[model samples]
Target: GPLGSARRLYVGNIPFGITEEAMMDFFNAQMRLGGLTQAPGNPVLAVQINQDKNFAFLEFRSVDETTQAMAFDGIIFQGQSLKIRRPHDYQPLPGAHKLFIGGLPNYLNDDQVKELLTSFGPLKAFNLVKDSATGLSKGYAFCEYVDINVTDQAIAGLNGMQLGDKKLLVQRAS
Candidate 1:
C-alpha cells in the first residue's frame, strides 16, 4: 500500500522461456523504433517478472510512457501475442493458450489442417469447425499450442496464406 500509485501495466502470457533482461531489451527496442530518444533517466522505473514466468508487471516513471505503452497491447513479439492490461484490471487467461484460424478449404481433412498448423510448433488441440446441418467443414478451425507462446508465430505465418482458394485469417481468440 505504500508504493504511491505509480503508473503500471500488467503483461500476461509471456513465453515462459524469455528472460527479464530480454523483455526489457524488447521494450527499449520498441521505444527506440517509435521515434523517441532515450530520456536522461529511465522512463521505465522497474520490470518484474512473475513467479512462474508467465506474466510480468512493469512500472513507468511517468504517465506519458504508460500512455505510449498502452498502444502495444495487441502487439506480437518473439512469437507471442502480448496481452497488456492496467494493473487495476489485470486478469489471468481462463485456461491454456488458443488461437483462431479461419478461411479453410472444405476439401482439407483434419490431418491436413493439423499438418499445416503444426509447422510453427506442436499443438495441444485442434478443432476444425463443422456445419451442424450438413456435417461438413465450416471453413475454419481453432488451434491450441502446448506452450501457448506460439500463437503469434502461427498468426503471422498463416494469416492470409492461401489454402485452396480462400485466404486464411488467423488471430488470437479474444
Candidate 2:
C-alpha cells in the first residue's frame, strides 16, 4: 500500500497568482492535448507546490504518461515558460553536495540553523540567506553534506517535516 507509484515531475516558473485548483485544471486540459487519458488510474495523482511558489511536483500514475507530459514543457503558462523536470533526476553540485531547505525560521541565526540541522548529520556548510542591506534572514537555507550517505539521510529525515508554523521543503539542489 505504501510507495505505490514513482513518476514525479517538477514543473517550474508557474505564476504565483495561480491557485492549485486552477493549475490542476490547466494540466487537465493539457494532458488531453498530449493524448493522455486519466482513466487507467488518473494520470495525475497529486501536485505539490514548492514553498517558493515558483515550482511544483506532479505525481503521475505511470512513468510512460509522465514522459508524454514532459513534452508539454516550454508551453506558455500565464505569460511564463513552463519548466518541467523529474525531481529524482536532479543533478547535485559537482560532488554529492547540498540540499536546499526552504520554509526556515526567519529568526534562526547561523548557530541555530546548524544546531537544528546537525540532528540529521554533520554538515560541511550551513548557509542561510540574508537581506543584502539589513542582514535579516530570508527564511531559507542550504546544507552542504559531508558525504552522500549524510545527504540521503538528511533528505529522508527532514523533507516535508513541520517546523514551527511552516512545513519544511527540503530538496536536493542542482
**How many backbone clashes does every candidate have?**
0, 0
lDDT of 1 by residue, 40-112 (tens): 5455667789858589877777666776787778778788899988766322443334677888888777889
How does each model score on TM-score?
0.46, 0.46
Error at 56, model 2, angstroms:
0.7
State the lDDT of candidate 2 residue by residue for 68-124, as single tens digits: 787878878888999987555433234345678888878889899788789976776
| Candidate lDDT (C-alpha), each | 0.74, 0.74
Candidate 1, residue 118: Cα displacement in angstroms equals 0.7
Q: Compute the lDDT of residue 63 as modeled in candidate 1.
A: 61
* Model 2 bad stretches (over 4 Å): 1-5, 38-41, 51-53, 89-174
Model 1 scores worst on lDDT over the 10 consecutive residues at 88-97
